[PDB]
Each structure stands twice: as structure tokens, then as C-alpha cells.
Design a protein around this ligand. Structure first.
Ligand SMILES: [Mg+2]
Ligand SMILES: [Mg+2]
Ligand SMILES: [Mg+2]
Ligand SMILES: [Mg+2]
Ligand SMILES: [Mg+2]
Ligand SMILES: [Mg+2]
Ligand SMILES: [Mg+2]
Ligand SMILES: [Mg+2]
Ligand SMILES: [Mg+2]
Lengths: 202, 159, 293, 176
RNA sequence: CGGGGCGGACUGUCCCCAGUGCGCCCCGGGCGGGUCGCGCC
RNA sequence: GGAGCAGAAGGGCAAAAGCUCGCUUGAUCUUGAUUUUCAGUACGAAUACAGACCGUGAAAGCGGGGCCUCACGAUCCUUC
RNA sequence: GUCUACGGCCAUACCACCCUGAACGCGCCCGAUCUCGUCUGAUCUCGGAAGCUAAGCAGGGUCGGGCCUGGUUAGUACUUGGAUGGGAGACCGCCUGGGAAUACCGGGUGCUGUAGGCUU
């Protein structure tokens, strides 16, 4: 059926996405990239924990779906159903080829898609409250068991799935430089229209 | 493998720069070119007449012939193991002058005026140029304050 | 809040503006490229074009050649400088274009010193004339015609100015097809109605027709003819005296007026500290207003 | 008084084009008679308008002749517009006014006003589109030094309705 | 970090309002570069 | 310009090179030079000129085929 | 201090909205006898001068959007040359030189040629 992943572990073939030129590609196994309670606002889930690669290699969509499933199951039976939100941060855009079951006319045909990950690159992220940190770490370790390379579990210095740090977060919210909307936040720079400042700051 | 078409591989070099399309500016047409001067060959792609080959794009030659809209240029091209002077007819939207030779001519005139003033005033002055000498021993004032102590930072993993 | 906006951030990010005089609507760079640029094996010969522009109240005739820093006007005539002899009213019409072109030609070649030869046609008949270069004497001035965005049809005042310059003595290549005497259906040039258009006899006929038909609409149309009392008679002779005065003394001279003050008629551009203080006190006044509540 | 009597020289809604149109899905003598009613109604020779693409549903193919239209401006335009509003009894109801300050309507039968019926000529309806302007709108279609007309010189729906009911004492916004 | 007399424009504290830049010269304070500089080490 | 420019794709193009009219046959007759593949041979294709005769336009100009990159063929023999 | 005509560079010049405009000018504007064009003197062409800055245009404004230019990002990413360096590999560190680009934060917002006007 599917070859062992060690045949396609390494990035050596010059990114190959599905386009005009690459037609007839099957669907990747990972279809859901976000999971859990995706509507908690910004401050329901302040703690973010990433699982980040430390190797230059490509991971298969099958491995991504397996890790997403097992991390989701541990988070569900540990932190409750609506106690977390996870996003995988890696989409399988690179198409891998297979040659048919001599070497004449040997250019293969699309059999799958993988995601190429770099050395410093987040593979998965979970945001949760500040008291489930060990549960996030355990879920990410048990999901780390589904990949070929070497991965590290790291708690971010930033508030949830944002790009602003947890110490300067509430101060920016209070001085209204950072307005919450949805899962994330908008940054308000002090160079727009003053009428925008007036419909804000009031 | 590949074709021997005349514009093979010229997807980007014969294109226009970003937000630079449309009408060709008229100063490029109203430059003058006397036979003997040094011109750069670039070859824009808005004009399709008289355009140079991709081997001559980005090159530099001298004018040997002037016609109504074009110029005959003598360019050095490197065929496999020899350099030979090719004679190409290229249009004035595709060429422009050479500031290198311009700079050389103005330092020639500066040298001539300097030698004239030295001869009339009775001195000896330097005319050549010298390649960036070493660095002439000097004192560095601390202005009373002590130099700041630098120190490598600890390792923290952000990204 | 339903339709996708078109002039958005990416629209202005990759918008490329046209040339300044194109997006002001004054220069056709197609015709400009074909008309200004000299052959490269001439190397420095200026290429002269006679710009003719008819505004709402004035006719401008210039003679220029292009340099890299911008064009160079050599001579310029004006319908507003026409009334210092002969005519006083009835500018920006075909007869005014003829005398303007004549004045520009005579001014240019008496600047160049070739007035004692190249007399053109000292009497006006609206027929085909082209100057020729007398051997041993300097060659005739060669100019082309810059009509700009003016739609060239039969009976355009740009061709009035062309006929004026050619009778003045310039050599401008042309044909009599776009002259008001030209008949389209017979491909024939009459030249007597062209002479009438040069003398302004069509406006005189309009004046006579309006007088015998009416009084109040006639003076409402030609109000500034009643002032200076330009009857439909003495219109052609008047233009003949205008032509004679141009041939007599075509040199331009201006007047000095230098006793002027330095008053600002615009507003100065505001400064950075002014703008910062403006937005500061605007915020302060807003917060003060919302605490008055 | 003093602040109101300044713009009255050059800021007055006047009637630009009347935009008369008849569109019928067939060609031939029906279009010739549809042009003949236009000639006898306006005094101008009208202009034919072609299909742009075959649709085959009700059935027209491209490059045919489908419509006859005419453009009328001035005193003739205002008096023909007067006749059309006499037919509409100076009532056009809510939303015929476009957001650019133009409007129009349709007439189902032309003989009512004006010209007497001719037995050869048919029974054709038509539609009126008045596009309305202001002195200085010709800079948008001037050839030399073209410009756009400027923001507060435009015609809005509100001032179009205000001008209509002030110049024809008509009625907008009926019982619905 | 600034003080005196003349010129515009801003603010929802506008008669009793406030604050900003620019033009004239008078000074006030501190910093640097050239000066037979001038001495002293 | 997200349209179109005969077709593959790329480039180019807006009072254009697109669309609609008007007039035409520079898709004609000639010698040489050059570029492209290149051995710096040929063909093919192309680019600057020059000499005629013309077309168009008020004119400057533009035009010796197709906006550019492809669309084609020695000796010998036959035919005009 | 500005404007017309023709421009050069071609957004610091564009776009959106708001305010001001003395004098010349540029326009809007009035008309269709002639020239010439239209279904339509709306456009184009012609003949004017009663009114007008409403509009175009110009200048200014906006914690404006774009654009231009700096800082930061960052000596980061990438990279020339070197090693009997490390590591099972994947890749990584060092030596010798070069060295970016977003996000984010400032400042700016048309210069100028020739000819001819107005501004006491
Ligand atoms: Mg490979
Ligand atoms: Mg190949
Ligand atoms: Mg190939
Ligand atoms: Mg060609
Ligand atoms: Mg033209
Ligand atoms: Mg010719
Ligand atoms: Mg020839
Ligand atoms: Mg901005
Ligand atoms: Mg280094």
C-alpha cells in the first residue's frame, strides 16, 4: 500500500505542490487542522505550548493526523472536552511520487503529500489555562511519538496563539493598544485616523 | 534538451521593472551618440525592433556607426575559448552611456589642469592614485569615561 | 458593505501612474515621440516644431525644439499682443490665427536677420504657396506643425496659423486639404473662400445677416464690436492694415514693472510641531467634551 | 437670503439627455416601424442597436438589430419629458431615481401622448431615461485636459427628487 | 534648558480662551572646529 | 488593464500593439553589412542601413508582411 | 508669490474627502451664420463674451490610504573560501570574508528647464 516513511523522510526534491502541472493528486489524510474549543477568546486560554521540530525533514499527512488524534484524545480525557484548543501548524503541500511496481521513463506518479519542516519550526500548538501545563506537555510528548525525527516541547513566552508576550499583554489590553477579537487580537497603532481613535478610546 | 530560440530564457531580463511599464521616456531617445564612445547594452522589452541578443544584454561596447534609429556597436563576446569582437546593430531604447569612461575623462581634465598649475607655480604634485594605504597611527581619547564592558548573552530559545 | 471595493490597498500598491502631462491631459506622447525626436545621424541639429494652441480666448503660437532638460522656445506670438496695432476686437478666430502665425514667422526671421529676403506673400491670396531657398543666401527656416490634441479637420485655426506662418515666410510641409477653401466631394481647393476666411469675411457676413435680421440678438452676440464700432465694412481693410503693420515692425518689446511688494497670496505648508499639537489638542478637547458629557 | 443667493449663477440642475429606447427581440419591418414612431415623436432619425451575444432562450443571435434608440436634449427634451410626465400624471413612485441622480420610466403605449395613431405603425411601448446634470459636467467628456467633475458638484438621489418635485410639482413616495 | 519687544495659523475651556511654527535684532546658557592664538607642564 | 492582440507559453502593449471606421498593397524591385545556430559553414529566421518605385497621414513620420520569441529545405533534374 | 504654453524626471507628483483663491490667465459658459461633424452643436469644428469660481485647476489640510526615504528586524537568514571538525544520518558548530527581506517604529510628500503674463 503505502511505502515506509523512511523512503520519503528527507527533503531532497525541490518543492512540488499540486497545481496546473501536477494533476491527479489524492487528498491528504489531515483535513482538520484546528480542534477543541476554537471559540475561546484570548484570555480563556493564556498558556501556549508548542511541539517544534529539531531536524530538516518532511512529515507525512498520515503522521500529522495520527499525532493530532492521539494528542486530542489525551487532552479530551485529561483537561475536559472544552478545556483546550489545538492547531497543527504544518500543512502537507509537497507531493511525493512513486515509480511503478526498468528505469526507462521513470518519472513517478503522485501518491501522497508531506509537509516539509525546518529546524526552528512549530509543528503543533495547544493553548489551555495556566494550570494544565503538565497535561499539555504530556499530550505533546505522546504526540511526539508519531513522527520520525526529533522534536522538543516548549512552553511559549507569549499569550496563547498570539505574537505578544504574557507580561505586556494585559497592559496593552488596558491601554487599548491591543483589542480582542475572536481567537486572536488586533494591534492598534497610533497612526490611523483620529476619528478611528475617537470611535475607540471612548 | 532545450531550444535554440532567440528569446529563450529571457522571461525576466526583457521584462519591465515593477511599476515602470507603458510609455518609454523621451530622454532615452534624445541622447546623442558619436562614433567612438562607450555604451551599456541592456535591452528593454517594450520595443521589439532592433533588440539585442541575450548574450549581449548587460554588456558594454563602443559605437562604430550611427544610423536613423540604431547604432552599430563593437562588443566583446566570449565564444568557447576565444574572445572576439562582434558588430551588432542595436537601438537607442536598448542602449545607454557609460559613467566609467565619463569619470575617467573628468579626471583626465583634472590631471591636465593640475599639471598646468604645478608647472606655472613651480611645485611637484601627485597625479596618480594609490590603493587605500594603511591607517596612520593615532590617539583615541577616552574622554575620561571607562569603556563599556561587553559580555556574551545566555542562551534562551525563542524561535 | 456588500460589494468588494476596487480601489483598495493592493490596488494602490501596484497602481502605476501615467506621465504627469498625460494624466493632466495635455500631452499626447505617441505624437510627441514621433514629432520631436531627431534622427541619430544628425547628432545635434535642432528639430523645430510650431506649437499651435487655441484656448477659449487666446491663440498661442510657439516655435520649439527639444533638449533633455525640456523644450526651448525660440519665438512666441499671441492674440493678446495682436491689438497693439490694427485690430482691437475679434481675437481667437481664423483671421486672428492667420495674423498670429504671420507675426510669429516675421518675428522669427527678423530675429534671424532674414527679413530683407523671404518676404513670403506680401499680398494675401489664399492659394498654395511654398518658399524656396535663394542660392548664395541662407536657407529657409524649416519647421513642422505641432497641433497637439486638436482634431485636425478642414477649417481648423491650427491650419489658419500654419497658413499665416507660411505666408510669413517659413517652410512648413503641408497640403491644402485641411484649408477652409477645400471641397471634399470634388477634391478641389477654391482658395477664394479661403481668402475670405483669412480676411474674416464670414464673420462680417454673419454680422450683416444678424443686423438685417435683428438688433438685440445681434448686439448680444457681437457686443464688443459695437464698442470700437467695427462695422461689417472695413473688416478686410482693417486686417490688411494689420498685415501691413506686422510686415512694417514685427519686433516684440516688453515693459518694465518691478515696483512690487512680496505679499503671500497662498497658505504656507503646516509644520510637524503644528500638526502634532493640533492632534494633541484635538484629543484633549474631545476628552474635555466627554467629561462635560 | 444673503447666504442663499450666491450659487444661483452656475449650480443649477438642468436636463441633459432624455435617452429614449425601444427594444424588441425581432428584426425587420417591426424595427422599421419602431424607428418610424421615434422619427415622428422626436423629429430625429434614430439609431439601431445590435445584439452582443447569442442567448437562444427567447432567441436572438449576435450582430442582429434589436433596438432603436435616440438621444434628445434641450427645449425639445423638456417638452417631450413634459408629455411623458403628463402620461404618468407627474407620478413616478419610489426608486426610479438612480444613485447618480438620473431616473427614467416606461410607457406601455405611445399614442396617448403624442402623435395620432397610424394603422401601419404598431402599438409599441418605449422607455425614457433622463440623465441629469449641472453646468460644468462637460469636463468629463472634453478631449483636451479632461477631468472628473468633483465631489460636491455631483447629483444625489435627494437633490434629484427635490429638483423633480420643484420643477414639475410632482409626487414621490406613494402610499406604500 | 531659555528670556524681550513684531508676523501667521490651531483648539469644543474661543468676548475674560488657551497652545504651535515662522520674520527682525538684543541678549542668556552650554557644546564642538579653525585662530600670530597665548601661556604653562 | 484583472480584457483583447490567429494559435502553445512567456514577454510586451491603454487617447496602445486592443476595438471601430477611412484610404491602400512596404507581403513590390535591388546591392552589400550584421545578428541568431555557429566550425563563427549553410539554410531558416531576424536586425540596421543604402538605391528605386509607391502607400498613408495636414505633417513629423511610419511601412519593404503578421507586436516579439516557431511555422521549414542543398547539389542534380524539371518548370516559369 | 504665482499662473499659462511646451516640457524633463515620471506617485515625495497618485487616490479619497474638506477649506481658501487678489490680478492676469486657464476654464465653465452663450450660440449654430460660415468651416466641419453628429441619432443628438452632448463630443468634435466654428462664431462669441451676459454671467461665474459651483466645477476643473492651484495652494493648504487629514494621529488619512498609497508612495519615497531611514531605523528596526539583524550581523539574523543566506553565502565565498577552509579543516583527518562534530554527528549513524538529517544536518549543525567553528575559521576567513560578504551580508539581506517582511511584520513593527520614524520623517517627508513634487523638484525643475525655455518663453510669455499678473502681483505698486
Ligand atoms: Mg531528486
Ligand atoms: Mg532542458
Ligand atoms: Mg524545453
Ligand atoms: Mg516585425
Ligand atoms: Mg495624433
Ligand atoms: Mg510620405
Ligand atoms: Mg527605402
Ligand atoms: Mg500615510
Ligand atoms: Mg562571518
Amino acid at each position: 500500500g503505502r511505502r515506509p516513511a523512511r523512503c520519503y523522510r528527507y527533503c531532497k526534491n525541490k518543492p512540488y505542490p499540486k497545481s496546473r502541472f501536477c494533476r491527479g493528486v489524492p487528498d491528504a489524510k489531515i483535513r482538520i487542522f484546528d480542534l477543541g474549543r476554537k471559540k475561546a477568546k484570548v484570555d480563556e486560554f493564556p498558556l501556549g505550548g508548542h511541539m517544534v521540530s529539531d531536524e530538516y525533514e518532511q512529515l507525512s499527512s498520515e503522521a500529522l493526523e495520527a499525532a493530532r488524534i492521539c494528542a486530542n484524545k489525551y487532552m479530551v480525557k485529561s483537561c475536559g472536552r472544552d478545556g483546550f484548543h489545538m492547531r497543527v501548524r504544518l500543512h502537507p503541500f509537497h507531493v511525493i511520487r512513486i515509480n511503478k511496481m526498468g528505469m526507462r521513463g521513470a518519472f513517478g506518479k503522485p501518491q501522497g503529500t508531506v509537509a516539509r519542516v525546518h529546524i526552528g519550526q512549530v509543528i503543533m500548538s495547544i493553548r489551555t489555562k495556566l494550570q494544565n501545563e503538565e497535561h499539555v506537555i504530556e499530550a505533546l510528548r505522546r504526540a511526539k511519538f508519531k513522527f520520525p525525527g526529533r522534536q522538543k516541547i516548549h512552553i511559549s513566552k507569549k499569550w496563547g496563539f498570539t505574537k505578544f508576550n504574557a507580561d505586556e499583554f494585559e497592559d496593552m489590553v488596558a491601554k487599548k493598544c491591543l483589542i480582542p477579537d475572536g481567537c486572536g487580537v488586533k494591534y492598534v497603532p497610533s497612526h490611523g485616523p483620529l476619528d478611528k481613535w475617537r470611535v475607540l478610546h471612548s | 534538451t532545450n531550444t535554440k530560440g532567440k528569446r529563450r530564457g529571457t522571461r525576466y531580463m526583457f521584462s519591465r521593472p515593477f511599476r515602470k511599464h507603458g510609455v518609454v521616456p523621451l530622454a532615452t531617445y534624445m541622447r546623442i551618440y558619436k562614433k567612438g564612445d562607450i555604451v551599456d547594452i541592456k535591452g528593454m522589452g517594450t520595443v521589439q525592433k532592433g533588440m539585442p541578443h541575450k548574450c549581449y544584454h548587460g554588456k558594454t561596447g563602443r559605437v562604430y556607426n550611427v544610423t536613423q534609429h540604431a547604432v552599430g556597436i563593437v562588443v566583446n563576446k566570449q565564444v568557447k575559448g576565444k574572445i572576439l569582437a562582434k558588430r551588432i546593430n542595436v537601438r537607442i531604447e536598448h542602449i545607454k552611456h557609460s559613467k566609467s569612461r565619463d569619470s575617467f575623462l573628468k579626471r583626465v581634465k583634472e590631471n591636465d589642469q593640475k599639471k598646468k598649475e604645478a608647472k606655472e607655480k613651480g611645485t611637484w604634485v601627485q597625479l596618480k592614485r594609490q590603493p587605500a594605504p594603511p591607517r596612520e597611527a593615532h590617539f583615541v581619547r577616552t574622554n575620561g569615561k571607562e569603556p563599556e564592558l561587553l559580555e556574551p548573552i545566555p542562551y534562551e530559545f525563542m524561535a | 458593505g456588500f460589494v468588494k471595493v476596487v480601489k483598495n490597498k493592493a490596488y494602490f500598491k501596484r497602481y502605476q501612474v501615467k506621465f504627469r502631462r498625460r494624466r493632466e491631459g495635455k500631452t499626447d506622447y505617441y505624437a510627441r515621440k514621433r514629432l520631436v525626436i531627431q534622427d541619430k545621424n544628425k547628432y545635434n541639429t535642432p528639430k523645430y516644431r510650431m506649437i499651435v494652441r487655441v484656448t477659449n480666448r487666446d491663440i498661442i503660437c510657439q516655435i520649439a525644439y527639444a533638449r533633455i532638460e525640456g523644450d526651448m522656445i525660440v519665438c512666441a506670438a499671441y492674440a493678446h499682443e495682436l491689438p497693439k496695432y490694427g485690430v482691437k476686437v475679434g481675437l481667437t478666430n481664423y483671421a486672428a490665427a492667420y495674423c498670429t502665425g504671420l507675426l510669429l514667422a516675421r518675428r522669427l526671421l527678423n530675429r534671424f536677420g532674414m527679413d530683407k529676403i523671404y518676404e513670403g506673400q506680401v499680398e494675401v491670396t489664399g492659394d498654395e504657396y511654398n518658399v524656396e531657398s535663394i542660392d548664395g543666401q541662407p536657407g529657409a527656416f524649416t519647421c513642422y506643425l505641432d497641433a497637439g490634441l486638436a482634431r485636425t479637420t478642414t477649417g481648423n485655426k491650427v491650419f489658419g496659423a500654419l497658413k499665416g506662418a507660411v505666408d510669413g515666410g517659413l517652410s512648413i510641409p503641408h497640403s491644402t486639404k485641411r484649408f477652409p477653401g477645400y471641397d471634399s466631394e470634388s477634391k478641389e481647393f477654391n482658395a477664394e473662400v479661403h481668402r475670405k476666411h483669412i480676411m474674416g469675411q464670414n464673420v462680417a457676413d454673419y454680422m450683416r445677416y444678424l443686423m438685417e435680421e435683428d438688433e438685440d440678438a445681434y448686439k448680444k452676440q457681437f457686443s464688443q464690436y459695437i464698442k470700437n464700432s467695427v462695422t461689417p465694412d472695413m473688416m478686410e481693410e482693417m486686417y490688411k492694415k494689420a498685415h501691413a503693420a506686422i510686415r512694417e515692425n514685427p519686433v516684440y518689446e516688453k515693459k518694465p514693472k518691478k515696483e512690487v511688494k512680496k505679499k503671500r497670496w497662498n497658505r504656507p505648508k503646516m509644520s510637524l510641531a503644528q500638526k502634532k499639537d493640533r492632534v494633541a489638542q484635538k484629543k484633549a478637547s474631545f476628552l474635555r467634551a466627554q467629561e462635560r458629557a | 437670503q444673503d447666504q442663499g443667493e450666491k450659487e444661483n449663477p452656475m449650480r443649477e440642475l438642468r436636463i441633459r439627455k432624455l435617452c429614449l429606447n425601444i427594444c424588441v427581440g425581432e428584426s425587420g419591418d417591426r424595427l422599421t416601424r419602431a424607428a418610424k414612431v421615434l422619427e415622428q415623436l422626436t423629429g430625429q432619425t434614430p439609431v439601431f442597436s445590435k445584439a452582443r451575444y447569442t442567448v437562444r432562450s427567447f432567441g436572438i443571435r449576435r450582430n442582429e438589430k434589436i433596438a432603436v434608440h435616440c438621444t434628445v436634449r434641450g427645449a425639445k427634451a423638456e417638452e417631450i419629458l413634459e408629455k411623458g410626465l403628463k402620461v404618468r400624471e407627474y407620478e413616478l413612485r419610489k426608486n426610479n431615481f438612480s444613485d447618480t441622480g438620473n431616473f427614467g420610466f416606461g410607457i406601455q403605449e405611445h399614442i396617448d401622448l403624442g402623435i395620432k395613431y397610424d394603422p401601419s405603425i404598431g402599438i409599441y411601448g418605449l422607455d425614457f431615461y433622463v440623465v441629469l446634470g449641472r453646468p460644468g459636467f462637460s469636463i468629463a467628456d472634453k478631449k483636451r485636459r479632461t477631468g472628473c467633475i468633483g465631489a460636491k458638484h455631483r447629483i444625489s438621489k435627494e437633490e434629484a427628487m427635490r429638483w423633480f418635485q420643484q420643477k414639475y410639482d410632482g409626487i414621490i413616495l406613494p402610499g406604500k
